[PDB]
Amino acid sequence: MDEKLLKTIAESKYLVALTGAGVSAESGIPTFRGKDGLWNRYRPEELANPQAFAKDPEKVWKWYAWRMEKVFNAQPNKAHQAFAELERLGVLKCLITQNVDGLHERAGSRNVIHLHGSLRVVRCTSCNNSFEVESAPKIPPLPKCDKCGSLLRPGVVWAGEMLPPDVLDAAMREVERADVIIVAGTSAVVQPAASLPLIVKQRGGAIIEINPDETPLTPIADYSLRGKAGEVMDELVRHVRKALSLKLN
Amino acid sequence: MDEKLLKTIAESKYLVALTGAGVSAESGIPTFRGKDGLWNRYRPEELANPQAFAKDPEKVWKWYAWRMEKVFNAQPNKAHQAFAELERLGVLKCLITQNVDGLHERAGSRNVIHLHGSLRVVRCTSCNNSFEVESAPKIPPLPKCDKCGSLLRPGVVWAGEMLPPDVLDAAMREVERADVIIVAGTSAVVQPAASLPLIVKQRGGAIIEINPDETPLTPIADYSLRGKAGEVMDELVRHVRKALSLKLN
Ligand SMILES: CC(=O)O[C@@H]1[C@H](O)[C@@H](COP(=O)(O)OP(=O)(O)OC[C@H]2O[C@@H](n3cnc4c(N)ncnc43)[C@H](O)[C@@H]2O)O[C@@H]1O
Ligand SMILES: CC(=O)O[C@@H]1[C@H](O)[C@@H](COP(=O)(O)OP(=O)(O)OC[C@H]2O[C@@H](n3cnc4c(N)ncnc43)[C@H](O)[C@@H]2O)O[C@@H]1O
Ligand SMILES: [Zn+2]
Numbered sequence A, B: 001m002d003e004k005l006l007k008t009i010a011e012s013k014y015l016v017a018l019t020g021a022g023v024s025a026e027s028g029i030p031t032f033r034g035k036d037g038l039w040n041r042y043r044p045e046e047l048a049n050p051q052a053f054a055k056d057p058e059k060v061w062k063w064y065a066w067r068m069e070k071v072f073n074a075q076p077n078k079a080h081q082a083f084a085e086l087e088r089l090g091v092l093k094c095l096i097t098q099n100v101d102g103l104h105e106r107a108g109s110r111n112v113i114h115l116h117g118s119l120r121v122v123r124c125t126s127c128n129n130s131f132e133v134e135s136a137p138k139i140p141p142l143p144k145c146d147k148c149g150s151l152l153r154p155g156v157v158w159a160g161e162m163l164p165p166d167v168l169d170a171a172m173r174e175v176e177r178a179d180v181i182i183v184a185g186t187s188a189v190v191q192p193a194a195s196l197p198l199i200v201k202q203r204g205g206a207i208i209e210i211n212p213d214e215t216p217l218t219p220i221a222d223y224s225l226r227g228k229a230g231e232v233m234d235e236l237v238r239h240v241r242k243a244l245s246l247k248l249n
């Protein structure tokens, strides 16, 4: 919490944010690399594989239905709320997220780019069908397609796969027009997201990183808040609404 | 703070609110009875008079022109913000305001009964014509009328006049269901509005009054928060958002 930090956020011309699983952790959703991620002694990187779904669809789907039921009952925590607020007040123009939970929209956020897909999405492993669901499917019985009849999968992006074309470009646009970016709850490793903030930094724009841990992005972000996105973001937006009251209006 | 108050708000089955000009002060819009209310030494009550209008329509329109000029440029404050926030959260079911400015909707409120008219509206004194301006009117020239050509007026309500159409019945229905009503920045002196809360109260409902001063409503309010609606409404809407995360879900 600094005057310059605030002045920066306050005077943004096109401020954007990039969120990761860390931002939802206080909502009870396990991160991807934290100890809270171990599911049956499995690391997330061992199930979100395109091969793992092939080696054994049963196990992977159990993991997803399990995650789904959790995200579908979870409540958007303070951090989510703060970003939703920062967009209402007009400061934040766009929110880029790697999370697949709809915890941001549940806070109210309008302009949201889902780089890695959504859990509400279930597309086909055979045809071109895809739909949104409301509940987690009791997994014991493997999900089949209501059309061409075949195997269904989580409408999310796995490693080695490729994120929706249009989506990355829309993001490439936001950060290519942004002057300031808030990077919260992400480990600064998985690409091509990690590279997004570096873009702003290249064009001169400013970076604000919110993370309890030091990350390979820290060493270059203009400012670096050491805490949980819940507190930081909330206490932050609180001072932003105050700073927002100055000049012409 | 007080947890009992919070519980009441958080657990309310149908909460509604009655606001007054006290909720638009911190936006720079004077109240009806405050020291800031005077205009050319005239008092509001003695100018927003249907008689005072016929007696000298040029002065009264000059006054309204001046007021609109302010409102059509004024920005919504924390109280405005907060009432809109509590509506998105699903707690505030309806907001009944006596304010003729349009700040509540601006902040984002959706369900708003405008008890006393609108400065955004101009209806004719004879024909049944009535439009909605978006900018202040040039005062030297009195308004026309693309219908019968008679004098035009602000679409508001003056003393001794009737309230807009189904308005009173609407608010009458709201408070006849309301288990909790928040009454912010109104002097609880002018009828029939000052009665709406009494309705709730004689039904075993809870009245949370918010006003820097003591009013004829104060001694019957279950909670009397003596402070500016800007700060009181902000702190309160925050506690509630959080506390709104307990039990079963
Ligand atoms: C497969 C898939 O859907 O894709 C995922 C995921 O989108 C992507 C990146 O992972 P991501 O960086 O978002 O998750 P990670 O598990 O890689 O990183 C989460 C970050 O959150 C931080 N963190 C934990 N609790 C926090 C809190 N309360 N507030 C703020 N930060 C906290 C933590 O220190 C860490 O850097 O790779 C994965 O491949
Ligand atoms: C004709 C017309 O325009 O109609 C009006 C108006 O709608 C109605 C009632 O007036 P109303 O009660 O709404 O305005 P009033 O001017 O009568 O009262 C405003 C109240 O707001 C309180 N107040 C002042 N500043 C405040 C702040 N920053 N936060 C919270 N409260 C503050 C103050 O103490 C006072 O009781 O009568 C008038 O006839
Ligand atoms: Zn299919």
Ligand SMILES: [Zn+2]
Pocket (backbone or CB within 6 Å): B124, B125, B126, B127, B128, B129, B145, B146, B147, B148, B149, B150
């Ligand atoms: Zn007319």
